[PDB]
Short mmCIF file of all heavy atoms in Angstrom, two decimals:
data_model
loop_
_atom_site.label_atom_id
_atom_site.label_comp_id
_atom_site.label_asym_id
_atom_site.label_seq_id
_atom_site.Cartn_x
_atom_site.Cartn_y
_atom_site.Cartn_z
N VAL A 1 0.62 13.04 10.57
CA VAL A 1 -0.37 12.07 11.01
C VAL A 1 -0.19 10.79 10.20
O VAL A 1 -0.22 10.83 8.97
CB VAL A 1 -1.80 12.62 10.86
CG1 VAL A 1 -2.82 11.50 10.95
CG2 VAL A 1 -2.07 13.68 11.91
N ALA A 2 -0.01 9.68 10.90
CA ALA A 2 0.00 8.35 10.30
C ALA A 2 -0.92 7.45 11.12
O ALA A 2 -0.82 7.42 12.35
CB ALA A 2 1.42 7.76 10.24
N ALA A 3 -1.80 6.71 10.44
CA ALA A 3 -2.80 5.92 11.14
C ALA A 3 -3.17 4.68 10.34
O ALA A 3 -3.05 4.63 9.11
CB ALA A 3 -4.07 6.74 11.41
N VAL A 4 -3.65 3.67 11.07
CA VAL A 4 -4.22 2.47 10.47
C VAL A 4 -5.55 2.17 11.17
O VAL A 4 -5.63 2.19 12.40
CB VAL A 4 -3.27 1.26 10.57
CG1 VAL A 4 -2.82 1.03 12.01
CG2 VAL A 4 -3.93 0.01 10.00
N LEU A 5 -6.58 1.92 10.37
CA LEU A 5 -7.88 1.51 10.87
C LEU A 5 -8.12 0.06 10.48
O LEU A 5 -7.79 -0.34 9.37
CB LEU A 5 -8.99 2.40 10.31
CG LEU A 5 -8.61 3.87 10.09
CD1 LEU A 5 -9.69 4.61 9.33
CD2 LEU A 5 -8.32 4.55 11.41
N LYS A 6 -8.67 -0.73 11.40
CA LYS A 6 -8.80 -2.16 11.18
C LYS A 6 -10.19 -2.64 11.59
O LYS A 6 -10.70 -2.24 12.65
CB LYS A 6 -7.75 -2.95 11.96
CG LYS A 6 -6.33 -2.84 11.41
CD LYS A 6 -5.37 -3.70 12.24
CE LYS A 6 -3.92 -3.33 11.98
NZ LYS A 6 -2.98 -4.13 12.83
N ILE A 7 -10.78 -3.51 10.77
CA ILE A 7 -12.05 -4.14 11.07
C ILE A 7 -11.92 -5.64 10.84
O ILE A 7 -11.30 -6.08 9.87
CB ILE A 7 -13.19 -3.57 10.21
CG1 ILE A 7 -13.40 -2.08 10.52
CG2 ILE A 7 -14.48 -4.36 10.43
CD1 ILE A 7 -14.39 -1.41 9.60
N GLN A 8 -12.51 -6.43 11.74
CA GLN A 8 -12.54 -7.88 11.62
C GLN A 8 -13.89 -8.39 12.10
O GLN A 8 -14.28 -8.12 13.24
CB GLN A 8 -11.40 -8.52 12.42
CG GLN A 8 -11.34 -10.03 12.30
CD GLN A 8 -9.97 -10.59 12.60
OE1 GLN A 8 -9.16 -9.95 13.27
NE2 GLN A 8 -9.70 -11.78 12.09
N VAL A 9 -14.59 -9.13 11.24
CA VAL A 9 -15.92 -9.66 11.52
C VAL A 9 -15.95 -11.14 11.15
O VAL A 9 -15.41 -11.53 10.11
CB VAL A 9 -17.01 -8.88 10.75
CG1 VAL A 9 -18.36 -9.56 10.89
CG2 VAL A 9 -17.08 -7.44 11.24
N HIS A 10 -16.58 -11.95 12.00
CA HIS A 10 -16.73 -13.38 11.75
C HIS A 10 -18.18 -13.78 11.98
O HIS A 10 -18.71 -13.57 13.07
CB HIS A 10 -15.81 -14.20 12.65
CG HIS A 10 -15.91 -15.68 12.45
ND1 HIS A 10 -15.61 -16.58 13.45
CD2 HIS A 10 -16.28 -16.42 11.38
CE1 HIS A 10 -15.78 -17.81 13.00
NE2 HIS A 10 -16.19 -17.74 11.74
N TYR A 11 -18.82 -14.36 10.96
CA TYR A 11 -20.20 -14.83 11.04
C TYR A 11 -20.23 -16.28 10.58
O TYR A 11 -19.64 -16.61 9.55
CB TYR A 11 -21.12 -13.96 10.18
CG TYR A 11 -22.56 -14.45 10.10
CD1 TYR A 11 -23.38 -14.45 11.22
CD2 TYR A 11 -23.09 -14.90 8.90
CE1 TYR A 11 -24.68 -14.89 11.15
CE2 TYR A 11 -24.40 -15.35 8.82
CZ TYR A 11 -25.19 -15.34 9.95
OH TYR A 11 -26.49 -15.79 9.87
N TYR A 12 -20.89 -17.14 11.35
CA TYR A 12 -20.72 -18.58 11.15
C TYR A 12 -21.97 -19.36 11.55
O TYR A 12 -21.87 -20.44 12.15
CB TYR A 12 -19.50 -19.10 11.92
CG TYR A 12 -19.48 -18.71 13.38
CD1 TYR A 12 -19.96 -19.58 14.36
CD2 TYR A 12 -18.99 -17.47 13.78
CE1 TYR A 12 -19.94 -19.22 15.70
CE2 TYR A 12 -18.97 -17.11 15.12
CZ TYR A 12 -19.44 -17.98 16.07
OH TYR A 12 -19.42 -17.62 17.39
N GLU A 13 -23.15 -18.85 11.21
CA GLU A 13 -24.39 -19.58 11.45
C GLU A 13 -24.66 -20.50 10.26
O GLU A 13 -24.98 -20.03 9.17
CB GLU A 13 -25.56 -18.63 11.68
CG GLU A 13 -26.85 -19.36 11.99
CD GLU A 13 -28.05 -18.44 12.01
OE1 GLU A 13 -27.86 -17.20 12.03
OE2 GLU A 13 -29.19 -18.95 12.00
N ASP A 14 -24.52 -21.81 10.48
CA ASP A 14 -24.71 -22.82 9.44
C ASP A 14 -23.81 -22.56 8.24
O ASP A 14 -24.19 -22.81 7.09
CB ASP A 14 -26.18 -22.92 9.01
CG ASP A 14 -27.04 -23.63 10.02
OD1 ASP A 14 -26.54 -24.56 10.69
OD2 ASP A 14 -28.23 -23.26 10.15
N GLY A 15 -22.61 -22.06 8.50
CA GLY A 15 -21.70 -21.66 7.44
C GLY A 15 -20.51 -20.93 8.02
O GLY A 15 -20.14 -21.14 9.18
N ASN A 16 -19.91 -20.06 7.20
CA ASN A 16 -18.71 -19.35 7.62
C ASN A 16 -18.37 -18.20 6.68
O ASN A 16 -18.23 -18.41 5.47
CB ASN A 16 -17.53 -20.31 7.71
CG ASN A 16 -16.33 -19.68 8.39
OD1 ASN A 16 -16.46 -19.02 9.41
ND2 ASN A 16 -15.15 -19.91 7.82
N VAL A 17 -18.23 -17.00 7.22
CA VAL A 17 -17.76 -15.85 6.46
C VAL A 17 -16.95 -14.96 7.39
O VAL A 17 -17.29 -14.79 8.57
CB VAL A 17 -18.93 -15.08 5.80
CG1 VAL A 17 -19.85 -14.49 6.84
CG2 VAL A 17 -18.39 -13.99 4.89
N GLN A 18 -15.86 -14.40 6.87
CA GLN A 18 -15.03 -13.49 7.64
C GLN A 18 -14.73 -12.26 6.80
O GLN A 18 -14.39 -12.37 5.62
CB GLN A 18 -13.72 -14.16 8.09
CG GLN A 18 -13.89 -15.07 9.29
CD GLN A 18 -12.62 -15.24 10.09
OE1 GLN A 18 -11.84 -14.30 10.26
NE2 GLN A 18 -12.38 -16.46 10.58
N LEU A 19 -14.86 -11.09 7.42
CA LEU A 19 -14.43 -9.84 6.82
C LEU A 19 -13.16 -9.37 7.51
O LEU A 19 -13.08 -9.36 8.75
CB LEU A 19 -15.52 -8.77 6.94
CG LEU A 19 -15.01 -7.34 6.72
CD1 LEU A 19 -14.86 -7.06 5.24
CD2 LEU A 19 -15.97 -6.35 7.35
N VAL A 20 -12.16 -9.00 6.72
CA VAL A 20 -10.94 -8.39 7.22
C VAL A 20 -10.67 -7.16 6.37
O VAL A 20 -10.67 -7.25 5.14
CB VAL A 20 -9.74 -9.36 7.18
CG1 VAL A 20 -8.47 -8.63 7.59
CG2 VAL A 20 -10.00 -10.55 8.08
N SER A 21 -10.45 -6.03 7.03
CA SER A 21 -10.28 -4.78 6.31
C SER A 21 -9.34 -3.87 7.09
O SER A 21 -9.33 -3.88 8.32
CB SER A 21 -11.62 -4.07 6.08
OG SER A 21 -11.42 -2.89 5.31
N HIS A 22 -8.56 -3.09 6.35
CA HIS A 22 -7.72 -2.07 6.96
C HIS A 22 -7.54 -0.92 5.98
O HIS A 22 -7.70 -1.07 4.77
CB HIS A 22 -6.37 -2.64 7.39
CG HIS A 22 -5.33 -2.63 6.31
ND1 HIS A 22 -5.28 -3.58 5.32
CD2 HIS A 22 -4.30 -1.78 6.07
CE1 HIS A 22 -4.27 -3.32 4.51
NE2 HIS A 22 -3.66 -2.23 4.94
N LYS A 23 -7.22 0.25 6.54
CA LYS A 23 -6.99 1.44 5.74
C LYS A 23 -5.89 2.26 6.40
O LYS A 23 -5.90 2.44 7.62
CB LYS A 23 -8.26 2.28 5.59
CG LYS A 23 -8.04 3.60 4.85
CD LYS A 23 -9.33 4.37 4.67
CE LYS A 23 -9.09 5.68 3.91
NZ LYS A 23 -10.36 6.23 3.36
N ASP A 24 -4.96 2.75 5.59
CA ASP A 24 -3.87 3.59 6.07
C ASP A 24 -4.22 5.06 5.87
O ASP A 24 -4.84 5.42 4.87
CB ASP A 24 -2.56 3.27 5.35
CG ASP A 24 -2.27 1.79 5.31
OD1 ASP A 24 -2.02 1.20 6.39
OD2 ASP A 24 -2.28 1.22 4.20
N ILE A 25 -3.81 5.89 6.82
CA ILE A 25 -4.09 7.33 6.80
C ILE A 25 -2.78 8.09 6.90
O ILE A 25 -1.92 7.75 7.73
CB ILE A 25 -5.04 7.75 7.94
CG1 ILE A 25 -6.33 6.94 7.91
CG2 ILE A 25 -5.35 9.24 7.84
CD1 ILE A 25 -7.15 7.16 6.67
N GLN A 26 -2.63 9.12 6.07
CA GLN A 26 -1.51 10.04 6.15
C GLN A 26 -2.05 11.46 6.07
O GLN A 26 -2.87 11.76 5.19
CB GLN A 26 -0.50 9.78 5.03
CG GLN A 26 0.51 8.70 5.35
CD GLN A 26 1.85 9.26 5.77
OE1 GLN A 26 2.20 10.38 5.42
NE2 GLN A 26 2.60 8.48 6.54
N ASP A 27 -1.60 12.32 6.97
CA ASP A 27 -2.11 13.69 7.04
C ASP A 27 -1.09 14.56 7.77
O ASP A 27 -0.05 14.08 8.23
CB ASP A 27 -3.48 13.73 7.73
CG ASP A 27 -4.34 14.86 7.22
OD1 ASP A 27 -3.77 15.87 6.78
OD2 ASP A 27 -5.58 14.74 7.27
N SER A 28 -1.41 15.85 7.88
CA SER A 28 -0.55 16.82 8.54
C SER A 28 -1.41 17.78 9.36
O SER A 28 -2.61 17.93 9.12
CB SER A 28 0.31 17.60 7.54
OG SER A 28 -0.46 18.59 6.88
N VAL A 29 -0.78 18.42 10.34
CA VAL A 29 -1.48 19.26 11.31
C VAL A 29 -0.60 20.45 11.66
O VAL A 29 0.61 20.30 11.84
CB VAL A 29 -1.85 18.45 12.58
CG1 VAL A 29 -1.96 19.37 13.79
CG2 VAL A 29 -3.13 17.69 12.37
N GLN A 30 -1.21 21.63 11.76
CA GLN A 30 -0.52 22.77 12.34
C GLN A 30 -0.60 22.70 13.86
O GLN A 30 -1.68 22.52 14.42
CB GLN A 30 -1.12 24.08 11.84
CG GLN A 30 -0.92 24.35 10.37
CD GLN A 30 -1.60 25.62 9.93
OE1 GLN A 30 -2.57 26.07 10.55
NE2 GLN A 30 -1.07 26.25 8.90
N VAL A 31 0.54 22.84 14.51
CA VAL A 31 0.63 22.72 15.96
C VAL A 31 0.51 24.10 16.59
O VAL A 31 1.06 25.09 16.09
CB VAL A 31 1.94 22.03 16.37
CG1 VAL A 31 1.82 21.46 17.77
CG2 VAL A 31 2.28 20.93 15.40
N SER A 32 -0.22 24.16 17.71
CA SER A 32 -0.31 25.37 18.51
C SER A 32 -0.34 24.99 19.98
O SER A 32 0.60 24.37 20.49
CB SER A 32 -1.55 26.18 18.12
OG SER A 32 -2.70 25.71 18.79
N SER A 33 -1.41 25.36 20.68
CA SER A 33 -1.56 24.95 22.07
C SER A 33 -1.98 23.49 22.15
O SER A 33 -2.49 22.91 21.19
CB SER A 33 -2.58 25.83 22.78
OG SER A 33 -3.91 25.43 22.48
N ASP A 34 -1.75 22.89 23.32
CA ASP A 34 -2.09 21.48 23.50
C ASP A 34 -3.60 21.27 23.40
O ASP A 34 -4.05 20.26 22.84
CB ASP A 34 -1.56 20.99 24.85
CG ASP A 34 -1.92 21.93 25.99
OD1 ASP A 34 -2.92 22.67 25.88
OD2 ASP A 34 -1.18 21.95 27.00
N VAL A 35 -4.39 22.20 23.93
CA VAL A 35 -5.83 22.04 23.93
C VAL A 35 -6.39 22.17 22.52
O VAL A 35 -7.24 21.38 22.10
CB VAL A 35 -6.48 23.06 24.89
CG1 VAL A 35 -7.96 23.21 24.59
CG2 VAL A 35 -6.27 22.62 26.34
N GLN A 36 -5.92 23.17 21.77
CA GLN A 36 -6.38 23.35 20.39
C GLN A 36 -5.96 22.16 19.53
O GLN A 36 -6.79 21.56 18.83
CB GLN A 36 -5.82 24.65 19.82
CG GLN A 36 -6.44 25.13 18.49
CD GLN A 36 -7.88 24.67 18.26
OE1 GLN A 36 -8.12 23.57 17.75
NE2 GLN A 36 -8.83 25.52 18.62
#
């Protein structure tokens, strides 16, 4: 398992602020049936 999660927020009422965030994920899984 390899993944990236991303968030981006912009707030600008009488001003300006931006949030930028990301996180990487690494994991493993036992494989069986497709449904499981």
Side-chain angles (χ1 to χ4, degrees):
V1 164
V4 54
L5 326 171
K6 287 182 195 178
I7 297 173
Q8 182 157 22
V9 171
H10 180 206
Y11 175 67
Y12 51 96
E13 182 189 347
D14 285 327
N16 191 44
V17 64
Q18 281 205 38
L19 163 79
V20 175
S21 183
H22 87 280
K23 176 178 180 162
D24 311 293
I25 305 296
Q26 275 259 335
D27 210 333
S28 77
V29 154
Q30 293 177 335
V31 200
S32 83
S33 80
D34 48 26
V35 162
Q36 193 27 275

